[PDB]
């Protein structure tokens, strides 16, 4: 078996000539299809691995990363590592934003593809819950694919409510304000906020709300949106959350065209609607696609939806380590000779 940087990366004779990318991700030559592919090693096991495999095997969409192959040992007893084989993608939006200025045409096209993929995910009653530039892969022709469904959940708006300062798992800079106030992130509006943040970041190459800790994230958001309105406050019924907001000095709204003096005015209109404080008033993915900014691309007949809502059969949260390994083994069975 081949090794890469002091790690065994043992991907049978099908995949050869391994180079590191970023458990470990390597590129490799697929000797069957005769293209370089991406392979990630997962090494007891995690709910997130299973969640992702079930979702990505069920999903089929041009703006969502697929799984092409999964490599594992023939038996549960011998299975330790799982390798997931996917299309090689030259770069991601995080790497691209660190090094490149995007034209308005590129920002428009990337945003379109993000929302087109998101329309499909949401149509399956799934929330991604960790959209950020590093989860948006790109190839040399700027095709974009959404990846990393390890924190994805079936939508559950009736159980979205929680108390103030409830701990959350997803990446801090892309968290909607309501996460810090009264939300478990179980509604589609959570993903739109992330997309808003990403749009802002494409406009200036810098994260819009780079909070350094849990409540600082909310301070950054309010520093630009300004103080919530009485009506938006009245929607927050939780008294700890409400009174925290009432305790803050008045903050004026920073005009988008002053933060983003170079941006297209239609892009800023859409940004505003995605970065709305009140999640009920926030634009939905299909409205976003229909927005004038995206007129050159918008075509709902060519923005497919999922054939059915996605379902986890049992609650993965209480699963002992043994049943989880067995579930991963079973979900990966179709790729065995
Ligand atoms: C989805 C982000 S990842 O880091 O999990 N996977 C990944 C990284 C780099 N290049 C890739 N090509 C396909 C999948 C990846």
Domain segments of the chain: what residues?
1-88+320-337, 89-319
Burial of residue 257 (CB within 10 Å: 0-12, 13-18, 19+) is exposed
Residue 77 — φ and ψ, nearest 5°? -60, -40
Q: Is 240 flagged in the annotation as binding?
A: no
148 in contact with ligand 1, CB cutoff 6 A: yes
Superfamily of domain 89-319: Transferase(Phosphotransferase) domain 1 (1.10.510.10)
- How far is Cα 175 from Cα 214, in angstroms, rounded to an integer? 10
The reply to whether domains 1-88+320-337 and 89-319 share a CATH topology is: no
Q: Catalytic amino acids?
A: 130
Measured by CA distance, the residue closest to atom 2 of ligand 1 is 135
**Among 65, 94, 149, which is best to mutate for testing ligand 1, by the most ligand atoms less than 8 A from CB?**
65
Experimentally determined by = X-ray
21 is in an annotated binding site: yes
For ligand 1, atom 5: residue with the closest CA: 148
CA of 137 from ligand 1 middle (Å) equals: 7
Pick the CATH number of 1-88+320-337 from 2.60.120.10, 3.30.200.20, 3.30.1360.70, 3.40.50.150: 3.30.200.20
**22 has binding-site annotation:** yes
Atom of ligand 1 at shortest distance to CA of 147? 1
- What region does 78 belong to: left with phi over 0, alpha with psi -120 to 50, or beta? alpha
Cα dist. 170→51, 53, 114, 222, 326 in Å?
A: 15, 19, 18, 20, 27
C-beta pairs of 235-244 under 8 Å, 24+ apart in sequence: 235/278, 235/280, 236/181, 236/182, 237/182, 238/161, 238/163, 238/164, 238/181, 238/182, 240/163, 240/164, 240/165, 241/163, 241/164, 241/181, 241/182, 244/164, 244/181
């Amino acid at each position: 078996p081949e090794m890469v940087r002091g790690q065994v990366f043992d991907v049978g004779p099908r995949y050869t000539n391994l180079s590191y990318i970023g458990g470990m991700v390597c590129s490799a030559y697929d000797n069957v299809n005769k293209v370089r592919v991406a392979i990630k090693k997962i090494s007891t096991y995690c709910q997130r691995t299973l969640r992702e495999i079930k979702i990505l095997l069920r999903f089929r969409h041009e703006n969502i990363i697929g799984i092409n192959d999964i490599i594992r040992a023939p038996t549960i007893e011998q299975m330790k590592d799982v390798y997931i084989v996917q299309d090689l993608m030259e770069t991601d939006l995080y790497k691209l934003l660190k090094t490149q200025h995007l034209s308005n045409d590129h920002i428009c096209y990337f945003l379109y593809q993000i929302l087109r993929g998101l329309k499909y995910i949401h149509s399956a009653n799934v929330l991604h819950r960790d959209l950020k530039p590093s989860n948006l892969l790109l190839n040399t022709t700027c095709d974009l694919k959404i990846c990393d469904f390890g924190l994805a959940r079936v939508a559950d708006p009736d159980h979205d409510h929680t108390g103030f300062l409830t701990e959350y798992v997803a990446t801090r800079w892309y968290r909607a304000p309501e996460i810090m106030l009264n939300s478990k992130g179980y509604t589609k509006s959570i993903d739109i906020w992330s997309v808003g943040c990403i749009l802002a970041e494409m406009l200036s190459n810098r994260p819009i709300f780079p909070g350094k800790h849990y409540l600082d994230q909310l301070n950054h958001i309010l520093g630009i949106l300004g103080s919530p309105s009485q009506e938006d406050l009245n929607c927050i019924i939780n008294l700890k959350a409400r009174n925290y907001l009432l305790s803050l000095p008045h903050k004026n709204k920073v005009p988008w065209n002053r933060l983003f003096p170079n941006a297209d005015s239609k892009a800023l209109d859409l940004l505003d609607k995605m970065l709305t404080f009140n999640p009920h008033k926030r634009i939905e993915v299909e409205q976003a696609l229909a927005h004038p900014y995206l007129e050159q691309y918008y075509d709902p007949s060519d923005e497919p939806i999922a054939e059915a809502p996605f379902k986890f059969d049992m609650e993965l949260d209480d699963l002992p380590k043994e049943k989880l390994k067995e579930l991963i083994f079973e979900e990966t069975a179709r790729f065995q000779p």
